[PDB]
Amino acid sequence: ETRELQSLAAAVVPSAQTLKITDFSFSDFELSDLETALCTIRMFTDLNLVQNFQMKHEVLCRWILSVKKNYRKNVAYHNWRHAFNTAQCMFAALKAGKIQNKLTDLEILALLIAALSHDLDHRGVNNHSIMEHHHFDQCLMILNSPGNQILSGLSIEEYKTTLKIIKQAILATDLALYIKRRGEFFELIRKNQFNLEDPHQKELFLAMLMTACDLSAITKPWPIQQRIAELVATEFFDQKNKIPSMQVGFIDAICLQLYEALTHVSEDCFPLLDGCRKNRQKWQALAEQQ
Ligand SMILES: CCCOc1ccc(NC(=O)CN2CCN(C)CC2)cc1-c1nc(CC)c(CC)c(=O)[nH]1
Ligand SMILES: [Mg+2]
Ligand SMILES: [Zn+2]
């Protein structure tokens, strides 16, 4: 054991309301690394994952520290904080968005692990789905490392089922796969044909839900979104006048239809769509000022 694992395993885990991780407007700028690790423990706990799958506390703590360490801090956006924010949005969509009741325990377990792991070992956008296969491979290696096996409490049937959902969920964060598959998702939604009891449409929904959380910074309050866009711009160009229009085009081409479709599935996910619309106004106003 290191000093980090000792102090994290011995610390008090505040409640979900104290940590504000149920809010879609959650922000991590004021949190330390230890504090984000505590938020992650609370996410597993309040989703009943520690209870239903008999996770040892020090194993989960070791797993979280392994995932965090296998992100690169020198990468401006695709780092541990992006993975942590993606998982927080997944938690909020499950809790506040009331999506948790539409899914099974194994699907929730896999979505949370996938959200935290979907960009492992990312080197930056400057440095198919070749990358997402590497991300899942990093996730699988951590899940099998000694002392980090948070899935040990599962039977082989549950374990094999969970690994497949994790793999599909991480591969789904490839925007090319999202663009190829979202046409079917919007077809069913606009035809009042969408049904989650269908295994094919359920897996499609899990893919869209991964992308919605992956891009959720675009939905944040304007002071926060402006800060995240600064990180994205740093990674895109360094590792300004055209950024406002680029964001508007990104919101129109990618984000708006997704968060509108997600609101159709769950009305309580509307805060994501509403924050995305407000950010489009702010960016469009700046684009016209150039
Ligand atoms: C802030 C600096 C500029 O960021 C961007 C610039 C351009 C694009 N365009 C596209 O991705 C694809 N375009 C192709 C041309 N099409 C007409 C429209 C769609 C996206 C971003 C962007 N990507 C992410 C995710 C990493 C985030 C984080 C949520 C973000 O905030 N902005
Ligand atoms: Mg990625
Ligand atoms: Zn990502």
Side-chain angles (χ1 to χ4, degrees), residues 1-2 4-55 57-61 63-68 70-72 74-122 124-126 129 131-155 157-163 165-179 182-188 190-191 193-196 198-239 241 243-266 268-290:
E1 297 184 12
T2 68
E4 253 207 311
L5 174 56
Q6 183 180 5
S7 43
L8 171 62
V12 180
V13 186
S15 71
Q17 197 197 24
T18 304
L19 299 174
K20 295 110 71 177
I21 53 175
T22 319
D23 314 332
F24 289 104
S25 294
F26 172 90
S27 173
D28 73 298
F29 292 145
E30 76 271 17
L31 301 180
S32 68
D33 279 355
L34 167 62
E35 284 177 309
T36 64
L38 292 171
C39 293
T40 306
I41 294 174
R42 175 53 60 188
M43 294 178 202
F44 277 86
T45 310
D46 275 20
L47 288 173
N48 294 314
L49 302 180
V50 177
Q51 159 65 29
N52 290 345
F53 303 110
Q54 300 93 42
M55 302 188 188
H57 187 71
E58 71 271 6
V59 172
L60 177 61
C61 291
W63 179 84
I64 293 172
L65 292 188
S66 295
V67 170
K68 176 163 76 68
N70 276 276
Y71 283 93
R72 288 160 188 272
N74 44 279
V75 181
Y77 176 71
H78 287 105
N79 49 49
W80 158 249
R81 295 309 178 105
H82 164 58
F84 170 70
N85 276 309
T86 302
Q88 186 279 324
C89 181
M90 181 69 65
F91 177 82
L94 292 176
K95 290 302 197 178
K98 296 188 170 303
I99 295 188
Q100 173 183 26
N101 287 329
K102 299 172 169 59
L103 310 175
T104 70
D105 280 352
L106 293 181
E107 290 161 339
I108 295 169
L109 168 67
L111 283 175
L112 191 62
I113 294 173
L116 287 162
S117 312
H118 82 273
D119 271 334
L120 272 167
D121 203 24
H122 207 294
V125 300
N126 286 334
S129 302
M131 253 198 308
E132 287 71 23
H133 275 99
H134 176 66
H135 296 322
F136 166 76
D137 205 71
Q138 296 284 115
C139 170
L140 186 58
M141 285 170 173
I142 294 173
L143 286 173
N144 290 340
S145 300
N148 293 254
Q149 298 167 221
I150 57 170
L151 299 186
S152 67
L154 285 66
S155 55
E157 315 96 65
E158 296 172 331
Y159 180 74
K160 274 142 58 66
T161 300
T162 299
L163 273 187
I165 306 177
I166 294 180
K167 181 170 180 171
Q168 292 172 337
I170 292 190
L171 292 179
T173 66
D174 179 14
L175 280 174
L177 254 51
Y178 160 73
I179 282 162
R182 68 171 183 169
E184 173 178 349
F185 180 56
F186 299 151
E187 281 188 45
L188 304 156
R190 70 164 168 262
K191 290 172 177 174
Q193 255 183 357
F194 191 67
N195 164 260
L196 281 167
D198 191 316
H200 174 81
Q201 292 178 28
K202 168 69 78 63
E203 177 184 340
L204 180 63
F205 172 73
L206 298 181
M208 304 290 113
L209 182 59
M210 284 294 301
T211 301
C213 301
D214 196 7
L215 310 175
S216 61
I218 209 61
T219 74
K220 293 299 182 177
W222 178 237
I224 297 158
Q225 150 64 201
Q226 232 177 328
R227 293 297 188 181
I228 304 286
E230 224 179 314
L231 297 179
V232 178
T234 298
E235 197 182 300
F236 280 19
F237 311 120
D238 300 350
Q239 302 182 334
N241 38 319
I243 285 169
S245 66
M246 286 194 289
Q247 289 296 84
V248 163
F250 171 64
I251 291 177
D252 284 340
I254 306 299
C255 302
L256 268 181
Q257 283 196 264
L258 176 55
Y259 292 118
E260 266 166 356
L262 177 66
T263 307
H264 180 247
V265 174
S266 180
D268 300 70
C269 292
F270 178 77
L272 293 164
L273 168 64
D274 183 57
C276 181
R277 281 169 173 167
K278 291 175 178 173
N279 282 333
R280 194 203 182 276
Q281 306 186 54
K282 315 294 292 188
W283 283 124
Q284 176 66 17
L286 295 178
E288 296 165 348
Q289 274 168 204
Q290 309 297 316

